[PDB]
């Protein structure tokens, strides 16, 4: 019943990897919802739409890399429903960037809890996998979203529709 | 409240497009689950894994094209949870191909019901969108999966593990 | 007497690196013996021979990288005899792949014990050297050998000589 | 007052990163002083001058990478005076290489103390940043300077001015 | 004790060159502090950060050219501590440009005092070195910073965060 | 039990080929030990290290060519332990070259005894294999090592560390 490849891979780590797969698929779905909000004819910011669609595809790659890790270590993937995002209408480019920053901090907190579990189960391959492929990516994503929120607030968003239009052209274009 | 672009787009068509978006995202998730089943070390058929991962990414493109249509016609996308697939373990390459054929026939039946609704609401742009981008794609997908099931059964799958290995190398490779 | 470069490098870590050098040279020698078994005229599977000769040369590179680490940290290499492999005749391609999987799991267990010693002696350079250059290589090697054993058993090896011939041509060729 | 990006970044780690920035800027300044000592007309070893000027520019890049890390994690850089180096006249190429080895061991000891603090504050992103970008660089720098000191002493430096001239041409040229 | 190359190089000129080396290293350090202020997530003007980091590296080249001059004329470099800059937080892009203009005028006044000393000691090689490599560079730097301050004030900085964002994109980008 | 390919291949020749395989693997291991001695920070002669590592890899190719010969003639390879080299510390570049000359003369004496056995068992294919692939290689290796020992002794090694440094740069570089 145990996989012939499994070695030093605790059942609690296997279950935490399955929960992280679901959270990465959920973040992919939130960014897909934000992307198509900015494609609506009454919002119409195409480079915001492009930026969040690229983030949706990168979160799906993060989930597929954890599914490959679960099979490489001999664990078994167990998928759950992907809940729908908490908003349908994201209000403004600034509000969506602030929601993305909040989501990325939540994903980063889950990865730090997974690292702590891997360290407590003395699984250095899993600790290094999370440090190499996920933790610096999340620090860079959080710093980029914080810079975007700071620039939109300083330019006068959300009240200034000129600010979001020019940020869409000069920063996200 | 009505979109400034909306013309000849009935609320029942808008709701049926939202249900089809969810079904395409669900099919993407079923094929992602099949792909990583064939990547397990106790199944180990890499070209089956590749074939179903490519199908998962194509179903996500089908869902994003319907989200773009909903915004082009001035409807509003409403997302729902993506339910987890009906199986975790798909048994054999033949059983997964038969499950994919069943899923693609279900998706095709939903598209034929959407076409019938668009014809009854006299929406020729939506009828042509479904004929141009979805109905022939589904007939081709169903005929390719039927050919794969026929070849695997004739070669002696699922009992012959030699049959699935050589089908993985010569048809899916 | 202490090297002028030595810093934060405990004598127990130096001795464990010398034991790991010997185990990597021993694994190189086991794979060289398997390679030339499959080159015999009464076994004659050339791509099995090639696959194990490539593994023998990669294990010698693993040993030379640990010898370079021992000199970079100011430890002193102490070599021991390389024992001959436990078998002369490896029986079949499936039996040799299962023996290789067993050997790679043993090498991985020794590397996990070396990581635990480096963590207990607070030597983060040595922990990171082992995570960066050895632990993911071993997880990938073990998953590839597990996939090869699974495919050979499903195709009907070792009893089916047709199975090993076609695996040699289509997977290892 | 807390940065919007800050997560899992303890104030003691932030202060230790500010001290390491100052030590890397101080090492850049020591190597700049050594470089221009070997450019004097009464010392005149141009490849020693080039080697230490390249080391000065690499230590400034090490300091700027830690300043970028401090902003990526939401800490605040606080700069201090850069003290002048302990020598004006470095005596001979061998004495300067021995002083560089001593300086690089001091920088490495400070990085090992920073790693230990990051491990005690459970900050795996900072532990991995220090292992990935600093600890192996320092082990390589210390082993290269130890090899240079060994070769200059064996060739008869500092008493043999022929030894330093030929080392400048054949090893540093 | 006198260098074999020294000719027509007065001890007061040698000491003034050592003070100018320290001032160029201090200006390099002020611009490095400004650069990383604009890289903070709550300021986030990347092209201001790039512009001041380039100025920091050019001031270090100005210091190294004066160290090369001191050795070419047979004087002896004597380094002093590099004091930390007068600010940690530079407030806004306009305030940092005004501080840079003030710093460059101070550096230019020191170079004009060095030229006057070289003229009073009848050292035409040193007068021409300062005119050729430093005085026109400083007039160009001061005119460029004055143009930047004028444009930022006319666009409405520092109160208009839109002004600094668009200046960062169109003038410094 | 006799191989279907075996013809004119006496059991005493088969056993002598197995002993020569072990001696070539032992010489590979002695040269690997010499290579990493010259990589130590207190010896630090990189081109001596490179020269002996290349010799280690060439002796492993000599052993693998005799394993291929044993299978081509239908004999059975029987491997034995590879004993560790007689020294851990090789003293100086001259002493290691003299030890290599002694080792290569021993390998050549074993090959001349194998040729004499093949001639006494009237096995001209094996005599020609040894003349074509091994005897002139050994005469060239012994003459090159004798030239290296002569040059190092004439330059004043081992007492002159300048001699070994310049031989490492001009002859082995
Ligand atoms: Na992610
Ligand atoms: Na579809
Ligand atoms: Na290995
Ligand atoms: Na450094
Ligand atoms: Na300057
Ligand atoms: Na040989």
The C-alpha of D154 sits at a distance from chain F's nearest C-alpha, in angstroms, of 5
All chains having 3 or more CB pairs closer than 8 angstroms to chain C: A, B, D, F
Exposed e or buried b per residue across B60-88, where buried means at least 16 C-beta atoms within 10 angstroms of its C-beta:
bebbbebbebbbebbbebbbeebebbeee
DSSP H/E element including A142: helix A136-155
What single DSSP character describes residue E82? B
Euclidean distance between CA atoms C108 and C136, whole angstroms: 10
Euclidean distance between CA atoms B36 and A64, whole angstroms: 9
- CB-CB contact of E111 with E127 (8 Å): no
What are the C-alpha distances in Å from D127 to residues A136, B122, C80, C127? 11, 64, 35, 11
Contact D5 A112 (CB under 8 A): no
Q: Where are the alpha helices (DSSP H) in C10-135?
A: 11-38, 46-72, 93-120, 124-130
Q: Kindly list the protein residues that place their beta carbon closer than 5 angstroms to ligand 2, a single-atom ion.
A: B 24, 59, 62
Tokens found for residue A123: 């699984």
DSSP H/E element including B99: helix B93-120
- CB-CB contact of F53 with F31 (8 Å): yes
HSE of E97 in the Cβ direction (CA atoms, 13 Å)? 25
Q: Which residue has the tokens 């002993």?
A: F19
Provide the CA C82 distance to its chain's centre, in angstroms. Answer: 14
Query: Quick one: angle between helices D93-120 and D46-72, nearest 10?
Result: 10
Strand partners, C82: F82
Euclidean distance between CA atoms E123 and E37, whole angstroms: 42
- CB-CB contact of C99 with C34 (8 Å): yes
The C-alpha of D164 sits at a distance from chain C's nearest C-alpha, in angstroms, of 20
Tokens found for residue E35: 């650069």
- CB-CB contact of D128 with A135 (8 Å): yes
What single DSSP character describes residue A134? I
- CB-CB contact of B93 with B152 (8 Å): yes
Cβ-based burial of A5 (10 A; exposed 0-12, middle 13-18, buried ≥19): buried
Sort out which chain D residues have CB atoms less than 8 A from C125's CB and list them.
131, 135-136, 139
Q: Which residue has the tokens 């009907």?
A: C156
How long a stretch of residues is chain E?
173
Euclidean distance between CA atoms D129 and D134, whole angstroms: 8
Tokens found for residue A119: 């360290």
Please give the distance, rounded to the nearest whole angstrom, from the Cα atom of residue D173 to the centre of ligand 4.
Answer: 23
Coil, strand or helix: which one is A110?
Answer: helix
Region class of A14: left (phi > 0), else alpha (psi between -120 and 50), else beta:
alpha
Q: Which ligand is nearest to the CA of D26?
A: 4
Provide the CA D129 distance to its chain's centre, in angstroms. Answer: 17
Query: Quick one: angle between helices A93-120 and A161-170, nearest 10?
Result: 60
> Is B59 assigned to a binding site?
yes
Contact A125 C109 (CB under 8 A): no
* End-to-end Cα separation, chain C, in angstroms: 52
Tokens found for residue B33: 């689950």
**A124: nearest CB among C131, C142, C143:** C131
Coil, strand or helix: which one is F151?
Answer: helix
Coil, strand or helix: which one is A19?
Answer: helix
What are the C-alpha distances in Å from E9 to residues E3, E6, E76? 11, 6, 11
Contact C85 F77 (CB under 8 A): no
Exposed e or buried b per residue across E11-47, where buried means at least 16 C-beta atoms within 10 angstroms of its C-beta:
eebbebbbebbbbbbbbbbbbbbbbbbbbbbbbbbbb
Euclidean distance between CA atoms C31 and C47, whole angstroms: 14
> Which of D104, D149, D154, D162 to mutate: most F Cβ within 10 Å?
D154
Considering Cα of B5, then B10, then B11, then B17, what sign does the dihedral take? Answer: negative
Chain breaks in chain F (C to N over 2.5 A) after: none
- CB-CB contact of E29 with E85 (8 Å): yes
**B36: nearest CB among A74, A77, A88:** A77
Which structural technique was applied? cryo-EM
Tokens found for residue B147: 């050919």
Q: Which ligand is nearest to the CA of E107?
A: 5
Euclidean distance between CA atoms D24 and F22, whole angstroms: 53
- CB-CB contact of F169 with D170 (8 Å): yes
Q: Which residues contact B4 (CB under 8 A, 6 or more apart)?
A: A41, A42, B74
Q: Which ligand is nearest to the CA of A134?
A: 1
Q: Which residue has the tokens 């169109």?
A: E170
Nearest to D82 by CA among D33, D121, D131, D29: D29
Euclidean distance between CA atoms B166 and C59, whole angstroms: 31
Coil, strand or helix: which one is E22?
Answer: helix
Provide the CA F65 distance to its chain's centre, in angstroms. Answer: 13
- CB-CB contact of D45 with D38 (8 Å): yes
Tokens found for residue E149: 């301050």
Euclidean distance between CA atoms F82 and F108, whole angstroms: 19
Euclidean distance between CA atoms C167 and C150, whole angstroms: 11
Sort out which chain F residues have CB atoms less than 8 A from C32's CB and list them.
64, 67
* End-to-end Cα separation, chain E, in angstroms: 52
Euclidean distance between CA atoms E96 and E94, whole angstroms: 5
CA torsion, points A133, A138, A140, A143, in degrees to nearest 10?
-170
Euclidean distance between CA atoms A28 and A60, whole angstroms: 6
Q: Where are the alpha helices (DSSP H) in A39-133?
A: 46-72, 93-120, 124-130
Nearest CA in chain F to D139: F41
Sort out which chain A residues have CB atoms less than 8 A from C143's CB and list them.
5, 71-72, 74
What are the C-alpha distances in Å from A69 to residues A27, B36, E48? 19, 11, 42
Coil, strand or helix: which one is C82?
Answer: strand
- CB-CB contact of A20 with A109 (8 Å): no
Strand partners, D82: E82
Euclidean distance between CA atoms B30 and B100, whole angstroms: 9
Euclidean distance between CA atoms B105 and A28, whole angstroms: 27
Within 10 angstroms of residue D119's Cβ, the number of other Cβ atoms is: 17
Contact D85 E68 (CB under 8 A): no
Coil, strand or helix: which one is B4?
Answer: coil
- Going by the annotation, the residues of the binding site of D for Fe cation are 24, 59, 62, 104, 138
Q: Which residues contact A78 (CB under 8 A, 6 or more apart)?
A: A18, B88
Within 10 angstroms of residue B8's Cβ, the number of other Cβ atoms is: 12
Q: Which residues contact E90 (CB under 8 A, 6 or more apart)?
A: E33, E34, E37, E38, E96, E99
Sort out which chain D residues have CB atoms less than 8 A from A116's CB and list them.
122
If DSSP states are collapsed to H, E and C, what string results for chain D? CCCCCCCCCCHHHHHHHHHHHHHHHHHHHHHHHHHHHHCCCCCCCHHHHHHHHHHHHHHHHHHHHHHHHHHHCCCCCCCCCECCCCCCCCCCHHHHHHHHHHHHHHHHHHHHHHHHHHHHCCCHHHHHHHHHHHHHHHHHHHHHHHHHHHHHHHHCCCCCHHHHHHHHHHCCC
Q: Which ligand is nearest to the CA of F26?
A: 6
Euclidean distance between CA atoms A123 and E116, whole angstroms: 70
Q: Which residues contact E41 (CB under 8 A, 6 or more apart)?
A: A143, A146, A147, A150, D3, D4, D5, D71, D74
Q: Is the peptide bond between C44 and the residue preceding it cis, with omega within 30 degrees of 0?
A: no
Nearest to C130 by CA among C7, C36, C24: C24
Q: What angle do CA D99, D103, D108 make, to 5 degrees?
A: 145
């Amino acid at each position: 019943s145990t996989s012939q490849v499994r070695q030093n891979y605790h059942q609690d780590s296997e279950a935490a990897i399955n929960r992280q797969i679901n959270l990465e698929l959920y973040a992919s779905y939130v960014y897909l919802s934000m992307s198509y909000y900015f494609d609506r004819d009454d919002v119409a910011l195409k480079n915001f739409a492009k930026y969040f669609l690229h983030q949706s595809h990168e979160e799906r790659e993060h989930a597929e890399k954890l599914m490959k890790l679960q099979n490489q270590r001999g664990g078994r993937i167990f998928l759950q429903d992907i809940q729908k995002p908490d908003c349908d209408d994201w209000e403004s480019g600034l509000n969506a960037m602030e929601c993305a920053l909040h989501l990325e901090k939540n994903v980063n907190q889950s990865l730090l809890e997974l690292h702590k579990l891997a360290t407590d189960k003395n699984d250095p391959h899993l600790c290094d996998f999370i440090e190499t492929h996920y933790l610096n990516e999340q620090v860079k994503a959080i710093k980029e979203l914080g810079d975007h929120v700071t620039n939109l607030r300083k330019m006068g968003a959300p009240e200034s529709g000129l600010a979001e239009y020019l940020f869409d052209k000069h920063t996200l274009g």
